Design a protein around this nucleic acid. Structure first.
Ligand SMILES: [Mg+2]
Ligand SMILES: [Mg+2]
Ligand SMILES: [Mg+2]
Ligand SMILES: [Mg+2]
Ligand SMILES: [Mg+2]
Ligand SMILES: [Mg+2]
Lengths: 110, 103, 16, 56, 117, 140
RNA sequence: GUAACGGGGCUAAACCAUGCACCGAAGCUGCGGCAGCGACGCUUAUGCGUUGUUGGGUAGGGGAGCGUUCUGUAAGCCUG
RNA sequence: CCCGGCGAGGGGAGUGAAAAAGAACCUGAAACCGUGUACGUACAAGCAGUGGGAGCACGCUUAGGCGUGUGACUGCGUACC
């Protein structure tokens, strides 16, 4: 492949991280860090190790170098809704989903 | 020249044109039998003799062609109501084509 | 060392 | 205090319309390689003139 | 002995489920379309098709009117001339000629106009 | 092959001009609108698009039926409630021949798109020549 | 909120009388096909060419079918 | 062996008929949520489909007005049980 580097669960929602990794896409690879390392919150750090991966992973599987690359595809898919139960008052329902999300990010070239 | 004649529907317009229709009545073939259909061309249409109504006289006709006498089409077409859904019927009429030897 | 190959180096050896 | 039909996917994002974060527009500082927050100076060691914390 | 009705399953459903002119939502997503969307079309096509031969009928005879009444005298008197004329009289859709071969039509107008007692 | 008459996406337009002044009133609207759709027009099957420019003039002269002139009223309603409704005379509205009295025409046609900007193709003015400011570009 | 022509508008685009023209429904007609059912020709269990004709339809009556699993069929047949 | 925090998890490499078989593991449908691309869409009224039907995107016929996603615009038109 043109080097990949997924996560797997990691725990933190679909929409929550579909956010962050929208800034990444198009340009990037060098811009990888800069625009994560600053842009705040949590979702946007569980990308800044799947990018350091998807780079060393292009210095192994792929012989490509740390300045090229592109980041031609990212998407966050819906990981298993990790379920449990909450109290409340009387009890009724506490669906409470601890929701999760796989990561996959891919860098290649022009 | 140009044209016009019926036998089910007034489809005829174009020159020879090769154009749809109905059929014979026992089963189209392909070949033909040389069945010239009968007069009605607005004296064709083209030429300074772009004559008005049809017959500038009798015997201005064309000839068959049997362009290829078949065809399906299919159209769902199935009704409904509020206590029964007859939903079940389809019924084309087959069809024959033609390339009519010009006026 | 090109400021990303640097962000590397400086750390890949703040390991060794 | 409840709806009656289901707020279709179509509308799913017609709130979401606005969010899709925006990121940066950063600059460097005369002394780090290309770091610098938008207001704090050299991350690279930490300073602006000199002895900000522990430097050179 | 068994049935595991689960094999005629989608075989029954995909069957119609394949009705995705968009439609929209479960109107081609789920079984809201059930029939309540396809059984729909499935009737709309019945009439609102069957309807066309009067929807292209009125059509022609608007043009047909505009033509002859643009040469003098309109789709009312017009047809009268035409009809009083045995072998000499054909009927619309081709009385659309007034758009590809005027003079032809304009000539028909004559023959109609003159037949007029 | 199969008939119907095509109508490109239009592909034809015009430049006519008509006075109004002559006390013809409303009856004018008709061929002022059919000719805005396609009457005289015996080609270009409408129903989908079509058109045909016109430009009426002055308008501040059209005898109007019989008594109508004094009485006919219009009613706008602003809907900003406060209990609206705005009765107004022909007499009083002919004190401003804009959108109206000449836009007793936008009501003689389709409405919705098509019939929408199928009527802006009218153009009004209230004094023919002298301030027929419109495109001089060739009329009839 | 005009709001007691549906509207735009009509002094005819209203009313009385009279008359021709035309628009108009799945009605009828034309034409290609389906089925049920009496006749003609022909062959000939038959059918099939034609032909008269009938097929809006809830409770329900009646009549043909469709496919799912298992069963001999069968150590037959498909099948790496 | 590589990224990682001596983690999760993942990328190479090995195995092997196969790892699209990786252990949450056979086949892997549905509801539901993403990423790619094409048409449509910011003067426009309603069970959202129907009949038209332009135009674009696309494959086409030594024209012959075609297949496909699309569907501006315009005749009807208030799901079922
Ligand atoms: Mg009819
Ligand atoms: Mg029945
Ligand atoms: Mg029953
Ligand atoms: Mg599997
Ligand atoms: Mg628009
Ligand atoms: Mg269509």
């Amino acid at each position: 492949m043109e080097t990949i580097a997924k996560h797997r669960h990691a725990r933190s929602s679909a929409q929550k991280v579909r956010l962050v990794a929208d800034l990444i896409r198009g340009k990037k690879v060098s811009q990888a860090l800069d625009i994560l390392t600053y842009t705040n919150k949590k979702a946007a750090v569980l990308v800044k190790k799947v990018l350091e991966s998807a780079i060393a992973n292009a210095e192994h599987n792929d012989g490509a170098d740390i300045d090229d690359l592109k980041v031609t595809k990212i998407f966050v898919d819906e990981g298993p809704s990790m379920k449990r139960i909450m109290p409340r008052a009387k009890g009724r329902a506490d669906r409470i989903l601890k929701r999760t999300s796989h990561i996959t990010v891919v860098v290649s070239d022009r | 020249m140009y044209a016009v004649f019926q036998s089910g529907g007034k489809q005829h317009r174009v020159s020879e044109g090769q154009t749809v229709r109905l059929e014979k009545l026992d089963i189209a073939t392909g070949e033909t039998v040389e069945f010239a259909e009968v007069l009605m061309i607005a004296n064709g249409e083209e030429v300074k003799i772009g004559v008005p109504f049809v017959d500038g006289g009798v015997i201005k006709a064309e000839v068959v062609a049997h362009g290829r006498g078949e065809k399906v089409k299919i159209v769902k077409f199935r009704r409904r109501k509020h206590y029964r859904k007859q939903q079940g019927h389809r019924q084309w009429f087959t069809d024959v084509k033609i390339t009519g030897i010009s006026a | 060392a090109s400021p990303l190959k640097q962000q590397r180096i400086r750390q890949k050896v703040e390991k060794l | 205090a409840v709806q009656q039909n289901k707020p279709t996917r179509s509308k799913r994002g017609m709130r979401r319309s606005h969010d899709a974060l925006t990121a940066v527009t950063s600059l460097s500082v005369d002394k780090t390689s290309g770091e610098k927050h938008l207001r704090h100076h050299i991350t690279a060691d930490g300073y602006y003139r000199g002895r900000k914390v522990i430097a050179k | 002995a068994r049935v595991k009705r689960g094999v005629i399953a989608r075989a029954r459903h995909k069957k119609i489920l394949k009705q995705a002119k968009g439609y929209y939502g479960a109107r081609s997503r789920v079984y809201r379309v059930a029939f309540q969307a396809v059984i729909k079309a499935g009737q709309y096509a019945y009439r609102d098709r069957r309807q066309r031969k009067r929807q292209f009928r009125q059509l022609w005879i608007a043009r047909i009117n505009a033509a002859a009444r643009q040469n003098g005298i309109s789709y009312s008197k017009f047809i009268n001339g035409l009809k009083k004329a045995s072998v000499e009289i054909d009927r619309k859709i081709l009385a659309d000629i007034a758009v590809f071969d005027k003079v032809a039509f304009t000539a028909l107008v004559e023959k109609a106009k003159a037949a007029l007692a | 092959m199969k008939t119907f008459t095509a109508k490109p996406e239009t592909v034809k337009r015009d430049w006519y001009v008509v006075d109004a002044t002559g006390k013809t009133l409303g009856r004018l609207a008709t061929e002022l609108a059919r000719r805005l759709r396609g009457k005289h027009k015996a080609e270009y099957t409408p129903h989908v698009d079509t058109g045909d420019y016109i430009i009426v003039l002055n308008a501040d002269k059209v005898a109007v039926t019989g008594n109508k002139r004094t009485d006919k009223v219009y009613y706008h309603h602003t809907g900003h409630i406060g209990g609206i409704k705005q009765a107004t005379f022909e007499e009083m509205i002919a004190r401003r021949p804009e959108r109206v009295i000449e836009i007793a025409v936008k009501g003689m046609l389709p409405k919705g798109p098509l019939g929408r900007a199928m009527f802006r193709k009218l153009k009004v003015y209230a004094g023919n020549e002298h301030n027929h400011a419109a495109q001089q570009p060739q009329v009839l």
